[PDB]
Amino acid sequence: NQVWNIARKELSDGLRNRWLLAISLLFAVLAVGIAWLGAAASTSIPATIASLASLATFLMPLIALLLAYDAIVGEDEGGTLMLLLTYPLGRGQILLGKFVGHGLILALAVLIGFGCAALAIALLVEGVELGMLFWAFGRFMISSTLLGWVFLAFAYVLSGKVNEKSSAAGLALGVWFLFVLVFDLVLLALLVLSEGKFNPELLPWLLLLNPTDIYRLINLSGFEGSGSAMGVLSLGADLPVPAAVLWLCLLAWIGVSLLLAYAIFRRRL
Amino acid sequence: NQVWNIARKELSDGLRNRWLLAISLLFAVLAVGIAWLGAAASIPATIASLASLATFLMPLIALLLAYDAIVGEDEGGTLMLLLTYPLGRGQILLGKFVGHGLILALAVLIGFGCAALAIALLVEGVELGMLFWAFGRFMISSTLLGWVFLAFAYVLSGKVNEKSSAAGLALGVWFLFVLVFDLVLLALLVLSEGKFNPELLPWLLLLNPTDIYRLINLSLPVPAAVLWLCLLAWIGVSLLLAYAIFRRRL
Amino acid sequence: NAVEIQGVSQRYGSMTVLHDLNLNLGEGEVLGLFGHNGAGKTTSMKLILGLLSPSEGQVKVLGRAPNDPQVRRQLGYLPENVTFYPQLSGRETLRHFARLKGAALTQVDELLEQVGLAHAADRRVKTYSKGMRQRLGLAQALLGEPRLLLLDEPTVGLDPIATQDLYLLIDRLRQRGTSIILCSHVLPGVEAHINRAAILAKGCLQAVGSLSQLRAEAGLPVRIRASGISERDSWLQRWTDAGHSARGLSESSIEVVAVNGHKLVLLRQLLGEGEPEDIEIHQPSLEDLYRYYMERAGDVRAQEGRL
Amino acid sequence: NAVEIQGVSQRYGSMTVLHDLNLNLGEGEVLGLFGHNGAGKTTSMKLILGLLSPSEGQVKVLGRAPNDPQVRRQLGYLPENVTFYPQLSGRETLRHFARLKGAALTQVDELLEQVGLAHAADRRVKTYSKGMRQRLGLAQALLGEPRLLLLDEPTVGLDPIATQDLYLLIDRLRQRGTSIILCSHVLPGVEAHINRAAILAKGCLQAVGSLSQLRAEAGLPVRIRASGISERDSWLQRWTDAGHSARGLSESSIEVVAVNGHKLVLLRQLLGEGEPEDIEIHQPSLEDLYRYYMERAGDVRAQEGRL
Amino acid sequence: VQQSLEPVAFHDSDECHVCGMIITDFPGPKGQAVEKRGVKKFCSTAEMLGWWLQPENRLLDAKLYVHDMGRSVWEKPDDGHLIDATSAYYVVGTSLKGAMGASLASFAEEQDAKALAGMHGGRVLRFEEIDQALLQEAASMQHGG
Amino acid sequence: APQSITTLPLQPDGENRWRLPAGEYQGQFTIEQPMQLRCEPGAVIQSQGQGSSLLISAPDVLVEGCTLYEWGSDLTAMDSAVFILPAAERAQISNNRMRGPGFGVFVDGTRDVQVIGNEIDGDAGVRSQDRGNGIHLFAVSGARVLHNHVRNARDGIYIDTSNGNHLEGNVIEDVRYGVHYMFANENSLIDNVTRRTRTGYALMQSRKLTVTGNRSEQDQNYGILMNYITYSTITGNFVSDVQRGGEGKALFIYNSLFNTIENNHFEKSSLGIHLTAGSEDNRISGNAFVGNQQQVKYVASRTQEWSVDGRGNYWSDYLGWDRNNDGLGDIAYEPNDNVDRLLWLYPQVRLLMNSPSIEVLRWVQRAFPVIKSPGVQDSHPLMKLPTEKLLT
Ligand SMILES: [Cu+2]
Ligand SMILES: [Mg+2]
Ligand SMILES: [Zn+2]
């Protein structure tokens, strides 16, 4: 299978990037520091759960968009895309191989960070039951890898459209700024400026249009704690959906964007 | 003079930049919004918030302008062409500095006259004597801060050999001179549990040009003119260092 | 036959790009493609490579359809400007391309000793010059056992020695049954190694054939110069009896232009009287034939001191 | 005499990149610098342009020092792979260079008509191809009234018709009095246009002279290709006993590798026995002379399949 | 620093730092806090140790001096006897009338502190175990009922 | 000291009721009989420069309507005007203008005093150290002072060790302390007005006292000073525009305990409320914190909840929403940050105040709840103003 050949090239290409290594080391040391702060303040479990969720939300889209902002537009202007099209390959094989390689890099970074944090929690806090810790941290790695794959597909969509790498970097910066900061500030301004009198039924349903809030709604299901620890995500308690609908919505956010990236890459010539 | 001949080309090439236009438009929009929020709720809170916004964004504009002034011309191959012209290495750097300084002055004039016009239109009974003086000092200090980071970009561009490393060094310069210095000063204040010498902190506040801008716009054993002299020294020493780096490359 | 393009009239919508191109490539030929106006050469490139589907006619590469794996494992393509992956090394890029083409990995060693990259097989591609990247592109082009090479400017940035050695390797490959298509804008330099030339203008194929059949079809003046001639005053006028204009530029550098129909009597006149030093029999080269065939398709010479 | 190098020896530290170079370019002459082993071409190139200083030697460009402000106003330079400011137009860049060079702006549009960039003069050069960027780099090189031009690969990416017109423009500028130095890694294409050659080995200067002097100094064979004068096998035997090679080709083609020292007697018999109607006699060209002159200073030949 | 050790004499217009009341109007020992700038003055020792237990003033380099009641009369203390408050003997629970909080009578010797614990039934203690809860309990047991 | 019957005693009615006519008199005077003297406008009882003007030692005296002027100023001799002994009982002074440099109305043990509606405008001289007290109450029980008007004195309505009395409608202007209470168990003051006073209402070492409806306009230093008071009730007060003189605090809680602070209104001050570290666990719910530069000062790391029975306070800088439409916000309000605690601990951080790193730190506190220290937050804050009648 040529998909594994493209993925084997992409793994060794992406593991030699130094910005990725620096940001993954920063993520690991920040997760260790947040775990040590939670252990020192320990019951402070929802505070450190929300802090780890916010750290992963701020850092893992950055890792995915730094990996895949030049996957298609960097091959086309590098002259190797036409060469690969003359090789016995399709376009779905190239896209699937790049997605598999970058997803393996994302899963490796997630596993390193949330293994270091779990080891720090296990060594620091005495008498901690492993039945909650293993379940919560496994949910953390699975949802973090899903969020990274969401932004990988976003980067593939934004890279298959442009014809220059600088515009791809600008669109990646705009995508990172829009989904992380701008959407929550827009929702907060809509809630504050209307005092909760602007469509009270439809407003909790707008949280499903941002994957970075579905991630925190997944990871704040077990330990709500206090109502001030979420801000706008206190609107998520009014959602009548069960817990698996958020997982299905994250999978749909992967799939729809991957199909759109395949359509754009197929049309592009 | 060849300085103006290079400065006109630098003016045209900087005004035809998409990233600079986008960041300047966002800066003007944020300044108008800050003026609107200050007018709806007077003078020194709006001045302080605009000073924080300028301290956030004006190093970013000055580093976006000139991170590839020397290394980008070397990679494009026109740097070898320009040295065969009847030209000097000092004249090239001086013309680039003049053009980028005029671009930054035009940017602050637009994005600050918009805020002043919004303040004068929305709030009445505020007259014009204090507003003109405060805003004139404010834009002059903003131009001086932009010229400081312009000279920093001219220092960092001549040392490197590739355009990608210049962006990383400009990002490190932006991080170190805005966030890192004040954070380690605060950490030195906390970890020394209050027995730090009170005569030493306002004089190590002079080692970062961003807080010199805040001390200018927030009016301190220092007088009111040594801040301006320190800002001019921060322009001049970095310009001399950029010229000394440029004269010894290749 | 290797390439059997028949009746292709490829269009980009409301305008006609290619118009009735009938090109038959044999086995062991080094036929080259020339042309600068219009996208006639590039559309033919993508038609042979299978990147473009013909709107009319049929393209047959190696007997089969040009988008099959069995003809894409037997085809070598060297593009114009390939940057490759700057973080990978020389061995890893060739191993990746050999795994993609399904070739053997041991050849990855031999090809790296075949062009120039035995010493620099461990350094990254970001520390490579233009000629080294051309060597790497040739090395991935010769992967497996290709039967059709489609090189696009193979000697841009290369050595004056490696150019000669690359053409020697191309002659070795054409002596074993492979067929090469060379595209280049440097017409002096490829005219000593091709077997056929195809000139394209305005989308149409103006002339095809060997370099002797092109000179037979195109009546062109032969530009013979007898440098170091013994006598020049009667050499100004002895060639003009049969219509060969005798124009001189130095003490003895006279370029007599003939009519290509009286070559025996001019050589008899040159050899019976007067002793020469080094006669340069300047036949109409590929540049002059290209100029004539662009003029025949509709073109005007530029003014003096222009372009 | 423009460029009067009188014994420079450039050393980048302990090792000497350039060692004892004695070049003397004439007025109204055309020189071609060739060489790839050491960095003797680039260091002498920077020595002429004034971007470097001789550690032990003298350079005189146009009579004065190479870094004079009056010398540099009458000097043209076309560098390698130069891309201009991509957001400026094709006319604003030329206006900027004319203001920097102290020329007249009224010349500028005339140059935009001379190099063929009249239609694309109001578009940004980020939409330019390689050929139009080379035309823009030539148009800035002909600014003012230059007396010495240094072109490095001036015909890369250009059309063949544009290449021929560029060489016609070079000869027209040479007739007025300017002196041109072209650097090229492709030797067929400039061989008919240079008046003098200069081959550089690893820090040394091998041979300077015209092509006749180089062919006289180097005992190089002459290559004759004929298509059926009388017979291949009948003309195979005649060159063998007199000390010349005769290649046994396939059919109806005679290849003669002769010594070009006794050929004055030899071609009389070839005239007397058959027709010259399909023949081509090639003197040892620039590639063969380059191969010999870099074989004379080391650099042994490669294998059967290599490079 | 030698500039943080001199005790400043009490004037007739000196105001307490917390209550703001005229200091030289009430009986009982007073309190002074001398850091390297100007002096804080208190009308009672129990209003000072209340100021000292705050987290703002704990990390200061202030020297605390308290009036010595073993060499002075309770009705009118004199500024000559101003001992260090960190090395002092505080007896609490007495029925003597203070100024603001508990009647923390200060001494420098064993015998007078043992006496004022004796014929008033109070307890003698040191500086370092003065706490907020003990101060509130003493104030409730002295001014309640 | 001549007797009060030395002046012409024309007798209107036969229940020991006399009527002093208009005109000026001189010297000190003493009442020793149960008399019901009622003066007329123009009856000036101006003494020379010294002595108690009207010394009352008699039960059931209903002196009403004098124009006492220029009594003494010797405070250690207690040179008052209406010195009233414990031997006197049921004093009922009413409606007399009063001007002098000493004590206004001094009572030192009389039960059931009824000082009602007097103007005790003092002298504008002296440095306010020796201006004297208008309405000094020493060791009093069962008193009731109503509708009085004290002006330009020292710490005027001064209550010292009193078990049970009522304060109502007293307007107090240009004094040092408005109402000063020391050791006053089971007390009550209702609807008092305090203007331009140096610290306003000072409550020091009292217990079980009720502070209801009193206003405080344009004070300085402190609005209401609370010192060592226990089991109290602060309900319905209105503190407005406390300027600097301290930096200006509307409420200053120091060494206090289990009190009830509800339904108040602290506005336009530099500090809305300053809670000391030793005073914790007080019932604080329903107040309005509008217009203040800083609302709560609590420099500690112990958590404090400021909402009882599910209802909290109104905060002007609160940015929240009420989707359930119950009147209470849907997110908790944190009045303080960690940078505020760093500024309160280390004042040199005042130099590093407008820095971008400060805003970065505040955003880090908002995004990462681990680094947030426990504070003074209240769950369910109000969305509208709870007190409107206090705004009038
Ligand atoms: Cu008091
Ligand atoms: Mg609610
Ligand atoms: Zn006190």
Side-chain angles (χ1 to χ4, degrees), chain E residues 16 19 43 47:
Chain E
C16 167
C19 63
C43 67
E47 184 174 337

Side-chain angles (χ1 to χ4, degrees), chain F residues 63 93-98 105 114-121 135 146-150:
Chain F
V63 53
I93 88 162
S94 304
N95 225 0
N96 37 16
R97 295 214 74 256
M98 278 174 173
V105 177
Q114 277 215 21
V115 177
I116 291 179
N118 322 62
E119 168 144 352
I120 312 184
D121 215 302
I135 318 171
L146 259 67
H147 296 270
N148 280 261
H149 213 316
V150 199

Side-chain angles (χ1 to χ4, degrees), chain D residues 189-216:
Chain D
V190 316
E191 163 194 336
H193 301 296
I194 57 176
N195 289 355
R196 216 149 56 109
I199 296 178
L200 289 140
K202 28 221 185 191
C204 285
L205 178 73
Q206 292 302 125
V208 191
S210 86
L211 284 190
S212 157
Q213 317 176 22
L214 292 202
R215 283 163 192 166

Side-chain angles (χ1 to χ4, degrees), chain A residues 34 37 47-48 51 54-55 58 188 191 195-197 200 203-204 228 231 234-235 238, chain F residues 319-323 325 330-334 363 367-372 377 383-384:
Chain A
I34 285 174
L37 255 51
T48 183
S51 310
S54 306
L55 181 66
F58 270 93
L188 175 62
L191 278 153
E195 261 176 40
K197 285 335 175 313
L203 260 181
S228 183
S234 50
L235 262 67
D238 312 359
Chain F
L319 295 178
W321 53 91
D322 195 32
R323 293 163 37 84
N325 292 14
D330 296 346
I331 44 170
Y333 178 69
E334 320 269 347
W363 165 83
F368 298 92
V370 280
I371 85 155
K372 264 202 281 213
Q377 63 151 358
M383 309 276 317
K384 314 272 191 263

